[PDB]
Design a protein around this ligand. Sequence first.
Ligand SMILES: [Cl-]
Ligand SMILES: [Cl-]
Ligand SMILES: [Cl-]
Ligand SMILES: [Cl-]
Ligand SMILES: [Cl-]
Ligand SMILES: [Cl-]
Ligand SMILES: [Cl-]
Ligand SMILES: [Cl-]
Ligand SMILES: [Cl-]
Ligand SMILES: [Zn+2]
Ligand SMILES: [Zn+2]
Ligand SMILES: [Zn+2]
Ligand SMILES: [Zn+2]
Ligand SMILES: [Zn+2]
Ligand SMILES: [Zn+2]
Ligand SMILES: [Zn+2]
Ligand SMILES: [Zn+2]
Ligand SMILES: [Zn+2]
Lengths: 221, 221, 221, 221, 221, 221, 221, 221, 221
Amino acid sequence: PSLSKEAALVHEALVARGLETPLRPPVHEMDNETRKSLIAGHMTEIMQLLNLDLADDSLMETPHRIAKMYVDEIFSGLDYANFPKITLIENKMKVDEMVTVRDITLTSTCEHHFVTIDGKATVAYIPKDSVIGLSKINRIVQFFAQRPQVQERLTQQILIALQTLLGTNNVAVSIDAVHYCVKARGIRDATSATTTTSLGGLFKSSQNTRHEFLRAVRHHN
Amino acid sequence: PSLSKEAALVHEALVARGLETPLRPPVHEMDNETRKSLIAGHMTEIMQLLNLDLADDSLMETPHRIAKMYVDEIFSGLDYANFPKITLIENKMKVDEMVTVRDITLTSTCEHHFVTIDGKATVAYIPKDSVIGLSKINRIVQFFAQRPQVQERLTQQILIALQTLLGTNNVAVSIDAVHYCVKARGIRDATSATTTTSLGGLFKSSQNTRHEFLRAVRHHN
Amino acid sequence: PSLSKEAALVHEALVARGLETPLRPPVHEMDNETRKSLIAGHMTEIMQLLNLDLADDSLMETPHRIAKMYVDEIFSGLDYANFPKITLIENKMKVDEMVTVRDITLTSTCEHHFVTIDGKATVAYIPKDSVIGLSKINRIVQFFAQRPQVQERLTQQILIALQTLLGTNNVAVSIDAVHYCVKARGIRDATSATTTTSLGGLFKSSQNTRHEFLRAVRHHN
Amino acid sequence: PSLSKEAALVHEALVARGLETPLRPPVHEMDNETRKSLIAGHMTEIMQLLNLDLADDSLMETPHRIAKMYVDEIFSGLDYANFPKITLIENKMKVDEMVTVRDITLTSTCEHHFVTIDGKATVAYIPKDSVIGLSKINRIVQFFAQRPQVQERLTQQILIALQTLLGTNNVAVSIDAVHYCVKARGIRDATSATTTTSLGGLFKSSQNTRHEFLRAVRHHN
Amino acid sequence: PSLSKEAALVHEALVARGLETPLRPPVHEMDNETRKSLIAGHMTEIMQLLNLDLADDSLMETPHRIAKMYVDEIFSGLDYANFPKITLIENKMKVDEMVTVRDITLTSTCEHHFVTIDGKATVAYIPKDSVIGLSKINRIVQFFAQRPQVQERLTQQILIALQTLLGTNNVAVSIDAVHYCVKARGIRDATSATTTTSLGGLFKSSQNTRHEFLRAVRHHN
Amino acid sequence: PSLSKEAALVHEALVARGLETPLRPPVHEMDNETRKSLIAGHMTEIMQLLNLDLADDSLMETPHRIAKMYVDEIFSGLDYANFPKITLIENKMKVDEMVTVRDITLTSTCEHHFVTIDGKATVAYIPKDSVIGLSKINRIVQFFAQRPQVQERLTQQILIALQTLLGTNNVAVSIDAVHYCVKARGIRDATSATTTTSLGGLFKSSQNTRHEFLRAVRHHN
Amino acid sequence: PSLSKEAALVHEALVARGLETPLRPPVHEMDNETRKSLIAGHMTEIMQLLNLDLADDSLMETPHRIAKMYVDEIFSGLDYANFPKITLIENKMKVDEMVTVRDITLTSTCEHHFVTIDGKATVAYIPKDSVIGLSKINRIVQFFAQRPQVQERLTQQILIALQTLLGTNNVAVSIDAVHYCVKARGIRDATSATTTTSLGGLFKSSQNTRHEFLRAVRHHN
Amino acid sequence: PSLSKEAALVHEALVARGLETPLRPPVHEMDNETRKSLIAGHMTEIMQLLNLDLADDSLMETPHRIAKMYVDEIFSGLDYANFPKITLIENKMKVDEMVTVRDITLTSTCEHHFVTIDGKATVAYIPKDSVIGLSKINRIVQFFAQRPQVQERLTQQILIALQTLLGTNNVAVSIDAVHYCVKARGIRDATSATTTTSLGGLFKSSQNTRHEFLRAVRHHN
Amino acid sequence: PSLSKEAALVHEALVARGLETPLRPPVHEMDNETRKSLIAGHMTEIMQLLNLDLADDSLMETPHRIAKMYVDEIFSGLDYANFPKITLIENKMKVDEMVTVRDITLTSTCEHHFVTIDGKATVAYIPKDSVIGLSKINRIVQFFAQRPQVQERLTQQILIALQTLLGTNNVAVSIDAVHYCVKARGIRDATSATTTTSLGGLFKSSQNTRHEFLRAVRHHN
Ligand SMILES: [Cl-]
Ligand SMILES: [Cl-]
Ligand SMILES: [Cl-]
Ligand SMILES: [Cl-]
Ligand SMILES: [Cl-]
Ligand SMILES: [Cl-]
Ligand SMILES: [Cl-]
Ligand SMILES: [Cl-]
Ligand SMILES: [Cl-]
Ligand SMILES: [Zn+2]
Ligand SMILES: [Zn+2]
Ligand SMILES: [Zn+2]
Ligand SMILES: [Zn+2]
Ligand SMILES: [Zn+2]
Ligand SMILES: [Zn+2]
Ligand SMILES: [Zn+2]
Ligand SMILES: [Zn+2]
Ligand SMILES: [Zn+2]
């Protein structure tokens, strides 16, 4: 009772290429309710250095909400215990052209200011011996997304994970997103978006394949 | 009085390629009024198991409605006695460029949860000896769509059937659809959509042809 | 350990007004895991009646997948043990103008055929003593959405629930949806949508208020 | 050297009506740099509790960026030392019809999870003796937005602030926004948005005026 | 075995108001296979009078196709044996606000030249004792649309029939359509469209109600 | 006094290639006014067979209106006496790059049911010795459009006609249309459209030219 | 053999209110081929004062084309011999709400520089004793449009004419157009449009009616 | 005092390639005012032949406005005394990639009926030694547009003019426009538009370049 | 205390290729507040020659505001003391496909009239050893945009400045803007816009790469 075959495989692959999120061993076995109260403790401190009145009916519970959100939600992707269960049917249909999943909702956080990243992901792969459940791609994407991230690392992690679970390197990933740490503060650019793409296999090597995919990416609604 | 030339041709061609829908032999001759009532009875139990009050004037008729929807409507594609009448005219116009029928309405069911799939298909072929009635393409698409499906299989069936009927390997099919078992539940993604395509003859081999078709696909209204 | 103050209040308000979903008392404490298998059992029988090979690597978990989806997901709103938690701060800001939450995502199922209803809700209220957490409105809407519904009933239920929890009659609800049993089968209308609305108090009696709300409805993205 | 007339006046006003952001007296004069280093202090603790390797070159400066962002940017409207410089020309043009500034860019933070709030503001007023510079309206709006807010309060603050600095009650404010703690977490609604409006003077009392303003609000690009 | 309660009710109500379609008594019992072949024969002559070569494999089947289209399809609305089965449930939800079904697909024929009319209908009613099945509205619209028409008459028939069936004068119908005998020939106007509406009960008398309905009409996709 | 040089050239080119509309020689000089009445006669019989009261002030001119429309309007392209006049200036500007006339309005009729075809054409050619009047392209397209057509044939005819009149094989034609016999009846698909294309000379042999043209097609307004 | 009942009626009505285009008696009976050669004569002169070389293959025929265009086309509305034939059916359907014809194509000329006016017309009337053929409104509109015009006079003429032919003053006309003499020369404004509206009867007097109509006008595609 | 280097150079170029607008030597020095009064002279004759009452206050100044418009505006590019002043900075920036000015407003007149031509131009060039001011490109384009044109010639004139004034053959020009003598008269096509492109240098010869330019052309707003 | 490493490196590189903004040696150390004041006077001077009454309570502050604006804001990119702080991280993610930043807000000024330039920039590069923080690119762009500019140069500057800080020639830049000196004065073209692009490394020599990036450019919102 710890990890799953797939979860293990992916994690190994990610460290092997040295693409895992920069983590440290958990040292000693610390409860999650402990981590959460500890984290609310610090949030109470920060909130006081801001001069907010924690006595307020609305503010009082924020430290604890921020604590559950960090551990249970927006960063749950740092604990492989949360990896999604994977299901794969055999490729009896003999699909040999690419399958594409466009405009996958994707919300993450910039590791640089812990601010929101709103974006869309398009993922395509060429089935080999197995066909993956379609929702699973959405879930694998949201998983890596729930981690403090840098867009370039995010795009690459997804490629590797899917590559690992599908059994081919013929996978491609493109992400188009908006960083609120560029929009809401700093340079305050309200109109820019960033686009990153990772291409494995034929998607990288074969010019014709490379463009059918790039030609398909970017489907604004 | 059973099946038709075309219906049987198509059916064989699918079984030959290992692409038919996972079916079992109807064992003993079961009349549809009988399948419908038996089915109706199970839905009656399922609704009771859900604590619904079948004594209500709105819910009362639901088991018979669901059973009829299953047998005559949404899954009627599993019975080749429903295959559409095909009509082919002689290619006296000597067309030798592709004919594309785009944005064909496509409603179907995900075989993993029996939930609505809503999408659109784009089909193209290059006439050899015969030109098919346009409406017939739409019809063929709906027939295979009225079956519990997996988008990747559904796509190939439309292809193989068309090739078979048209006497050419020069056919291409593309489907862009939304799966409600991805949107309405589970990961609950309100924006992703899946695109799958299958190309035959020149649409596969000729890079020229292939990209002309792909280029034309995706005509959002 | 059974029900929560909010939940019980809501369920009673609805019963008193005769707007609860038609439900028959459980009878005996039948365990949920028992219900799922009985349901999954009947689904198996239904699928064998359609002649599908349940021995297929893709159709085997289906009966089980449906059972779990029905009981745990799309019909979870039938069990008040799933009523969302309510958080209400006091109206110190002295807000006396309607707050409007629009384009709330809403996926439901029709009770006449158990087919997908995909729509959008717009809720509005004039806070009296308390202001509610914004997401709770969303959560309340989805709770009632996960039930075999009739759009007319669904709209009323959301009104009563909200009127009850906020201690006011000044609430308004409008739902704009697409029913697949109209779209995907039957008459097969691919463009019609249905709009229903429930107006309480001022939204109903005051011409001025009523139109301010209706004017602000139907925000297609 | 502390505060300016404008700010003290606005500040008093909000406090008088019980609409100031819940703040605690600083207590003792803590140097903003200490504050930041303390905040960055606690954030480091938190990042360690999430098991992130702060030894990494990318995560290394994060606690310090967050600290600086919090105090100097996203929450800078908590200190009136930051209130914008107001300019008021004489209303010689004898303007007696509303002036409406629409689609003011507004990015704030919800106070329940400190997550991004992205929206637009529409402000109108009827000039009495003074006529404020246009951009000031933009600056005042963004001032109160740089605080842990609640849309209902933020709307009121803006109204009160402008009525005060303008000399009239004839001011209207409407904000329309997306709360990411609703969109990127929890219920995860990708489509809803919230609209709040605060009406003063003729905008509240005069129906003709009230609807002239409501009619114009909501200019999506 | 002839007509149905509702079919006859509706039919009478139209004749009573002098709104039925200009029909004559079927004289002697003429079987539809007979009407179809007789019709087919005239189209055969008309096509010959046009110098078309019925020996061609594409034109050969046209007379039988046109006759069937006329009798079973596009004009099948002239025979009440085709009226749709109506289903009404008890208004236990006590709805007392209008229900609007908007953008119903409507294809019809101009009676002046037997040319396609393509448009959309918006229908609304306020339930008294009963709520009708939504799909039934669409169906009723198509029934009266499958008749040689004049938009102004077609609009009223839908109204009167609905009033009759729903036991209320509180119904409203609006149709926006394109006439191909205006677009495809004659003046040849590629952009005009005609809107016609008929209001009953409160939708006529109450200015309040009337404008709420009109306000909601015209939902271009 | 019978036919014009252009007309005769065109009619012959089409006959030689076997692409003329299937026509049977008149036989005897039957006067057009005689044809119209015989046609109007049969239409009368057809309408009486549908049970319509031809004595109605609105249905009385119909048989006569149809006859005139068929012979004089929508099928006028069957009589080369209606071929448009051609004006060709010499190519002094030495134009050697394709001229493209796009979104040419095209309304036609299907030959399988005589129902409206509403579409758009895009024509392109590389002038050799002569440049044609722009409107003539339009006029040529509508000439062939006014004939019971099959889109595949229609496209070829326009190519041949233009190739013939301009003395070049460097012409290209693409037609994008909606067939009401698909939309308004039968399968009743409300979203599919059909695209056909005919490429001559360089447009067919030169990869470079072919794509420049296809790339420039499908200009939805 | 000169004029038609309707044509006369309208012309009288127009002079009676003194709204006719400023014409003069034709003095003496001058042939139309004479007027046209005379007019080409002057056009040849103008063209020479511009230094164009009329010897050119393209220019040579312009004087005559401009001459036919003026007399036979763009100004044919100055000769009531061209008025359209009107057909009116009796209002047996008892329509008593307004009928509307939107986005009627309308091309005219400014009397001030004989340059193009591109626009759209919306016309509505409330049937009284008779219902007019729908295409007839389009034709009456294009008729007055084919005259040197000033937009305000144009709008009024149409009102009167329809008022005269329908037998009620309850008619309304709105025109939205673009004047190329404002766009292509002079101030050269590329974005403005002008809108004129004439309201007769209840459309002018009754506030409620006045706005249902104004609320409907302006349907950009 | 007659012409400038720029103009004489352009002029010679067009004449050398046989692309100048067909002009006749002025012959004798006629004073532009006489010309205008002569032109206004003939236009008065024409308006009298159309039976318009020139005694009217609105039609009174028309012949004089037309005369002035013709000579001083819409046809002013016929006199090179009107050629724009060209400015050329030194290409120090060493720009070696194309510069593309898109959607240049272009309003011209067709030379067959002197009717409005409204369109857009897209121009690109690859700087060699000189780099022209941006607006000049706009001015040169509008210079040749102010002439009775033929789109095919107008496109060529612009190309030649710019190649000459720039020092390179690397210039591309594409115009897309609506001819009103096609839209407002004759065939009356409300939707078609014509596209003409002229390619020089690498734009003609280099496929890579050619398609980079064609790819970017056609930016509808 | 003068300039930073980066700043220096960029500035040199520009001078080296001779693409620096034409600057003269400051000569003697003149304080800014002194420059601002000297400029202010010269404004008061100009505003007096325009005849504007500087005594007005609203025109008063202008020379001082224009004063601040030129030096402190819109031309601040002239002083490298303002170059933004650059932050790079290790490319441990092994990113080797391009990273694209689109629709970057760009507000410049033309150097020919000091008039507003309003565009959008798209920047891309293929990471080598370091990966720049996203927000930085935006900052670099606004820096060079804060200078009296000529589009063709601005594009070039942004390119070199980036190739220098990233250590790769593999950078690409595209700018699409509207020059108000072309729109609001002079030729007054309200619709044209200009596009300039600079390609380094593979973006210039690799056909494939070159087109991947050009295919991405131009993301209108
Ligand atoms: Cl930053
Ligand atoms: Cl799942
Ligand atoms: Cl039904
Ligand atoms: Cl929550
Ligand atoms: Cl007509
Ligand atoms: Cl069919
Ligand atoms: Cl003027
Ligand atoms: Cl013509
Ligand atoms: Cl200039
Ligand atoms: Zn960041
Ligand atoms: Zn599923
Ligand atoms: Zn249903
Ligand atoms: Zn929150
Ligand atoms: Zn008609
Ligand atoms: Zn057909
Ligand atoms: Zn004018
Ligand atoms: Zn012309
Ligand atoms: Zn400038």
